[PDB]
Structures are given as C-alpha cells and as structure tokens.
C-alpha cells in the first residue's frame with residue numbers, strides 16, 4: 001500500500017499537489033490511498049469535523065471531502081476517513097472516553113456512518129497516545145479496532161492504522177501492538193519519519209521495522225517525511241528504494257510536499273512501482 005495524508009491546515013497547497021505531475025509521475029501514479037485528517041472524536045462516542053478557526057475551515061466540509069474522493073475515483077485510489085486526536089495537541093483523553101465500554105460501539109458506529117455518508121473507501125485511524133499506554137487502554141483500544149475491523153470487513157472497506165514506530169516505550173498504539181493489529185487491518189503506517197531509515201538503530205532500522213511486522217510485512221508502510229530530502233544518512237529516494245526492494249509499502253506524511261525532493265519524478269516513479277496498478 002502507498003498512503004498519504006491531507007492535514008486540516010494549508011489545504012489549498014495539498015489540493016494543488018494532488019493533481020501535480022512531475023514530468024509524468026505524481027500522486028495519481030504513486031498513491032493507493034489518500035487520507036484527509038479532517039475528523040476528531042468528540043469524546044462522548046461521536047465524531048466531528050475539525051473546527052479550529054485558524055485551520056482551513058473553508059475545506060472542513062462535505063464538498064471538499066468529495067473533491068478528494070472524486071479525484072481518487074478517477075484512478076482507483078481510495079479515500080480514507082482519517083480520524084485523529086491532535087486538533088489542540090495530542091489528547092489521549094478524547095480517545096480513552098471514546099473506547100470505553102460505555103461508548104465504544106457508538107464510536108465505531110459514528111465513524112462508519114460518516115464514512116458511508118460520504119461514499120468513502122475506508123478508515124485511517126490516527127489516534128495517538130504518546131506515553132499513554134496501560135493495560136486498560138491496550139485492551140479497550142484493541143477491542144475498538146476489532147469491532148471497527150469486523151464492521152468494515154462486512155462492508156468491503158479498508159482499515160489502516162497509524163502507530164508510533166518504537167516498541168520499547170509506553171506509547172499507544174506502537175509497534176508492540178502490531179502482532180495484534182496486523183490481523184485486523186489492511187495496513188499499518190509506522191510513524192517513524194526521520195527516526196527510522198535503512199541506517200537507523202535496532203528496531204528503528206528498516207530491517208527492524210519489517211522484522212516487527214513479520215506476521216504480515218506486506219501490510220507495513222514505512223512513514224517518510226515530505227519536508228526532508230534525506231534522514232538517517234540516506235536520501236529520500238534511497239529510503240523509498242529500500243521499501244521497493246524489501247516488500248513493504250510507504251506512508252508519506254504529508255501532501256504539502258514541502259521539500260523539492262518530493263516534487264521530483266524519480267521518487268513518484270518509485271512509489272508508482274511499489275503501488276502497482278489499481
């Protein structure tokens with residue numbers, strides 16, 4: 001899989017980038033999935049569009065989501081409802097109350113209802129709890145993911161999740177949860193960015209990332225940053241080439257394509273080859 005995201009700020013730039021062709025290759029050739037990060041939990045079992053008035057409020061609406069969806073439908077690209085908990089910083093409390101026994105079914109229902117309402121192709125879960133794991137949070141989050149997975153499966157829809165890239169800390173969800181998440185999802189985006197690479201250390205090396213996904217490495221997407229042309233002692237293109245040669249995917253955060261290296265034909269050609277035809 002090859003995924004990218006549209007954050008809820010600077011949206012005009014991301015929208016322009018969707019239609020770019022860098023001398024013949026661009027996002028329409030490289031992505032299988034596109035994820036507008038436009039929704040948040042309300043904390044009581046429901047969901048909401050982003051509402052911060054200093055974000056791209058002119059785009060937090062159904063018509064703008066359908067622009068993305070219709071763009072992707074031309075190519076067989078899938079638009080994913082991306083729900084996150086970072087509107088005002090990363091707030092795990094919004095997730096913890098959503099995945100409790102009282103609200104969990106309502107939360108799944110609200111997510112799926114919104115995806116169906118807009119004729120989207122699946123859900124990209126981007127709910128982040130830095131240093132927030134506990135036994136209760138692990139259980140409840142995995143019960144949430146299993147229920148969401150079963151519901152989306154019956155609808156023929158895709159499910160992806162973004163996680164922290166390490167396992168040795170107390171993050172949720174992180175690579176210590178991959179063995180339980182892999183059977184439930186179509187893809188996992190490891191949010192390693194400049195901390196993971198060919199030459200990084202241990203679990204954060206790309207070999208270590210793939211090893212932690214050993215149950216189903218074809219479902220792993222290595223997270224790579226649009227604002228850098230290199231990290232961990234390799235070029236952006238080299239990092240993509242490692243994914244190509246080692247049977248994993250790529251997750252590009254994000255569609256602002258801020259560094260010129262991500263505005264080049266070569267890297268989009270490589271992503272197109274990783275993706276394959278749709």
Ligand SMILES: CC(=O)N[C@@H]1[C@@H](O)[C@H](O[C@@H]2O[C@H](CO)[C@@H](O[C@@H]3O[C@H](CO)[C@@H](O[C@@H]4O[C@H](CO)[C@@H](O[C@@H]5O[C@H](CO)[C@@H](O[C@@H]6O[C@H](CO)[C@@H](O)[C@H](O)[C@H]6NC(C)=O)[C@H](O)[C@H]5NC(C)=O)[C@H](O)[C@H]4NC(C)=O)[C@H](O)[C@H]3NC(C)=O)[C@H](O)[C@H]2NC(C)=O)[C@@H](CO)O[C@H]1O
Nearest residue numbers: 009086087088089126130162164165166169191192195253
């Ligand atoms: C201390 C301890 O006890 N243990 C240490 C342990 O914690 C360490 O583990 C590391 O912790 C850090 C900190 O928690 C982790 O860093 C976080 O990682 C996640 C996942 O990568 C990041 O979230 C995703 O990644 C991108 C890139 O950061 C996110 O994009 C950012 O999103 C924010 C919020 O929307 C954007 O901010 C907005 O920016 C606009 C424009 O500038 C501005 O107008 C807005 O006002 C502003 N809004 C807000 C609310 O701030 C920001 O621009 C954007 N960044 C970029 C580059 O585009 C994206 O949303 C997340 N989702 C997806 C999908 O990618 C998270 O952002 C990041 N937190 C911080 C503070 O940077 C780290 O992952 C983790 N590392 C590992 C390996 O586990 C370890 C290791 O260091 O050491 C222990 O000691």
Ligand code: NA
Nearest residue numbers: 167168169176
């Ligand atoms: Na852990």
